[PDB]
Amino acid sequence: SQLFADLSREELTAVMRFLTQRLGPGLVDAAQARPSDNCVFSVELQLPPKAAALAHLDRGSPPPAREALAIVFFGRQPQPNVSELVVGPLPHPSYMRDVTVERHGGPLPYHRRPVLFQEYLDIDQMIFNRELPQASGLLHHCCFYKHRGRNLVTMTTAPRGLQSGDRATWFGLYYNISGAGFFLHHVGLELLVNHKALDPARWTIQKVFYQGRYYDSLAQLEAQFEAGLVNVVLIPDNGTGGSWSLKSPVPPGPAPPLQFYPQGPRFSVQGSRVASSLWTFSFGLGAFSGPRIFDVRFQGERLVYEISLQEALAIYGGNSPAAMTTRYVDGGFGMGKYTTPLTRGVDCPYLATYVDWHFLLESQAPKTIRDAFCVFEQNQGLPLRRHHSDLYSHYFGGLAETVLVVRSMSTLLNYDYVWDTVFHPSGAIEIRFYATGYISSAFLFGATGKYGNQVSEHTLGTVHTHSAHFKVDLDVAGLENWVWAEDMVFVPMAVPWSPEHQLQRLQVTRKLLEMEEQAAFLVGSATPRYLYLASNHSNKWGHPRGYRIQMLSFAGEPLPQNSSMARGFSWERYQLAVTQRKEEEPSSSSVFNQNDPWAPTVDFSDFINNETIAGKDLVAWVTAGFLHIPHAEDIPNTVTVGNGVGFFLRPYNFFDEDPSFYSADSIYFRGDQDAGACEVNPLACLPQAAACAPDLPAFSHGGFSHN
């Protein structure tokens, strides 16, 4: 009976058929509609309100209605409109509601709609068949043209235009590499396209870029080339390793270290609920916001209503226009939408339990992305804790750290983003993310070096920053929370017993924060060392029951406030902020900012405002990221090592004593026992590890949906 559980195939098949009948016709499958059509872009879970939800959970109350959110594209009509419509209740839908207005204020400018597959495709279409053949000449001598342009292929960018309501997208051309990253094979050609018009047939090419010069059309370029005024240089079709491959040329070795659970796995999962000895939670994946978990309960007490990914950012600098304009708000494509199957044994431990995911986006029928999350429990080869006494008393006590883990990955164009949430035995929670995949590359010539590093022959690794945003709804000891800030200080001070003769005196600096703007820290200026959300309540020794936040962020220096685009993602400007949780401030960003961020559909900076945070339902907003100047060793992919970024939620006089103390798996003995005695040291046991070892599930793979 869970209510944070993403929608089933049956629930979607159910909502869709409800929409369809009750939107008359005019209705087209989003899959292949033109701008001028009506179509259903997204049907996905609508989150419930916190009040009714807890009421339901912690007090028997019947559960709040189970509702869905349909994003609908209203092409056909002279006031073309994107409407967010709520549909309910599930499982048998019977109502529908244009929230659009009351959500944002207006209705939605039809140009904030993100580009459909059909649209993307009609654009390629025009390029490959109207436009490109006007330089068939140049592109022969440049880069192997023939006969139409099956050898080449394009990539989206940025926001699309320079001011609000533009729909003007730069595209690069890359050799259509077979079985590797095309992303590294930028041909040197970039095309600004104007697909704003509802009639694609009215679409344009506002500008063109080749080898450092701008033009106003393709044929105008070719003209110039033919005039002999342009040193074309041939740019290799194929090659060897790294750039050109992902297949390792070396053969496989001895097999690598493998973890197994000698007697059963010690967690379980049905639905989207996970249950372990210590931990409990629901989980899932918003189409746009992506990963998230709910009702996280440790030994049965709830710590967080919700932790969810809000948004992700990538901001470039560059030689070319496409790159120097490009700033992706990847949520405006969808981490849900673009999530990929976990390849058993590589993305996750071989023996993880892998879960499927369902969606109805840009289609009329629901679909599954297999092996979309994995859950598992992992040994770190670290002790959680450990003491060894050879002084005064001879004994040892310690405990190895196992950990529980939930992972999804979202492959976005070139990047593969890894999303981690990690549940510790100490009661702590670690959220972490990693950038892998391939990188975004430009073509090389001259200016380079202010904008990055030749990472390959002809290829420029464009500089950029990654950044990411998390909503963190801690309900430390129940809802009313305060926010505290302890740091340290030294104080010059004569030494009591002999004062002349001074001593630097270490001291704590505790301090409460009433107002939103005190608890709101921008990149650049310093966090206090200890910062946590406390409760009204006290632990046993008389301290406010706390949970500390602790970031691991390397601070991609953020886009100037000064910029017109800025307010489309002003969360990048903050490391940490805290806020009065409101039902109608449910997100940092939104899908509709990607395409018009000059007029942001959501603007975070608003959430901060005079308001008090002495004893309210708080919510913290954590921002995490780093600067990525590419280098040769991002070839082919960029590795995870030292790309960890996230933060820690940590008990802080929340408990009365570290709960590991009550661990099944801790170990103790004193010199004067037989340390190798089964009922003295549980490790002295184990002997026989099953009949023979892991019984491994035969390896499968998700597939390539749209496969």
Place this chain on the structure above:
Amino acid sequence: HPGQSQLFADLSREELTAVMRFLTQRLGPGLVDAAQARPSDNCVFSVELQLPPKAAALAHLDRGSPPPAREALAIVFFGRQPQPNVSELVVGPLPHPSYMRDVTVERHGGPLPYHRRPVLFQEYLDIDQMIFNRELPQASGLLHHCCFYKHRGRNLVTMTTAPRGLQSGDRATWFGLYYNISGAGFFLHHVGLELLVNHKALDPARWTIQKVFYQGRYYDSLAQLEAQFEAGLVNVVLIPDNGTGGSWSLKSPVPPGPAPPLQFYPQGPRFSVQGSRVASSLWTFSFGLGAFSGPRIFDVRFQGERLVYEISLQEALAIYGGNSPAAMTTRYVDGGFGMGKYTTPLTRGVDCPYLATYVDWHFLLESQAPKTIRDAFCVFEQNQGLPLRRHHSDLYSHYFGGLAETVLVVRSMSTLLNYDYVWDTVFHPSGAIEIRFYATGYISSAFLFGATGKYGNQVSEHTLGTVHTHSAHFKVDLDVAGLENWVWAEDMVFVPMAVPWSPEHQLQRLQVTRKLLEMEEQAAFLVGSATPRYLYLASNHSNKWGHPRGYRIQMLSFAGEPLPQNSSMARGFSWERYQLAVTQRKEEEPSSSSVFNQNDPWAPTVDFSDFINNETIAGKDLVAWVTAGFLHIPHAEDIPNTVTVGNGVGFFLRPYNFFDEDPSFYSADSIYFRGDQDAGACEVNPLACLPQAAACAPDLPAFSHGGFSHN
């Protein structure tokens, strides 16, 4: 003739007993075992490896030369004399020594003052005797009353303050008093009695007490405390003795339930250890353990090429504040007792994975018997549970390419009083190297007195968790593709600009910002200072694509605040005051600390700041000096023990245009397949084979533990 010798190995027992014999002889008139030794006695305190000059070493390993004389270094206390000194002695050539030289003035420029020498075990006992026998006796009444004092001792217990004194030449320790708990930490059970003992004189008879402090009050002596108490005049607080859970135990009352995940190598280890030298398919190196300076690795080679000559713990710190005299005046310089010396056995299946491979370590400290420490190090390969890299292509072409990150690890743990420090080192398949250090163990705790809360939190009853900082210095002698290295700082910048193709408008132009640091002080960054996103050392040489070949230093501190430079003391750990420095590598710029700084940081044997001195760092043998740390404000969840999670702290050494492509491209365990293929095929995918093969896990070694004290 590629020089295939060991020379970064610490000594064997033979090697020690040999040197010990050598010295026995050549000192003769009145030598004593140190474990028995007086103040006025003469003493071999330590004998350890003395490591080679680099010149010679490299010549040997690289241009197949003859390797340098293996030698050793002996610390000797010349107490039996008119002007007692400490002396540092070199003894070679091992294995059969035949010569001995004094380097005490070579290195330091005078003799060493004798009070700089560490406190011997013998001393500690003479001190404990003075206390438990000539003093607490005189306050029988108080103690009978508060602290259960049955005429004896197996009752209370002392523990030692940081620097002993407050001015150069002093040797006066504040000593806390606490309950002899059996089977758990005594650290928490302070009775609120601290005693300022003065144990300078070389006649312990002459040793005195200079102050008392009892539960928040100062008193001139223990007599003058009964004086009060008995005359009704002191308010006593009664401080229990038995208890349950947390503070009193370390033993889980709940029974063992199912088996944690377990890690095993389905066909053979994929690395080997051969004494000091570890070697795997890609990494190869020597390791060891300094007695005081602690863990260290050498001659690290990825795929045959060397990146670092040496990485090596330099010092550990802990600065306390508090309410008590003890705590408020503790700044521990843990090297002055020694992170080698106080290493402890890694407890198999807790401190490393069960199937790791564990390694004994030998030493000769405060004795004449060489002794061993069983399983002091562990080494192993670990499946991290990540991928080093994946990419899944759904668009244009269907394919997957990925690699789960398995990594290689070397560990040591140094239990120093309360602390259990863990020291890692982790060798990622990308050619990266992760240094990493945790604090667990127990908390140094004062007795709780009213005005707390700007000295910590309340933790058990009567139990204050005093606040402290943690530093740990490291030495990184990168030799990046050659000895001659430069230092680069790259970073980012926005510059606002007209939009080229529609200059009506304006964009923020993101830009890179390389800057070469010529001089030492340019590359010397203080704690809480602005700090180059990309910083690395590099060769004149350069990769295929033309960028200089480089290794990046990427830090992970939450670093405490430094003891103020105002203080007459920071002298003794100037390294604390730096995020990071870079420096010309010199042979007499070997350690940044010295065991002898602990007991005299007003006259520091080694002051790291002198190392920064206006020199070029352009195209030299450069060595980097990373400092890592964090603020600890204890709390209830540090009971019974402090916990790793989030207390890990260190740095990364990451390649940066050093290669021409990510080395892992060629890995064996790499995986790839196209959309048009079958991924369930052994011939497409190694992982298809892990049901049929990879069944049968090893029968496991029956637990052995390496024991306590002197084993």
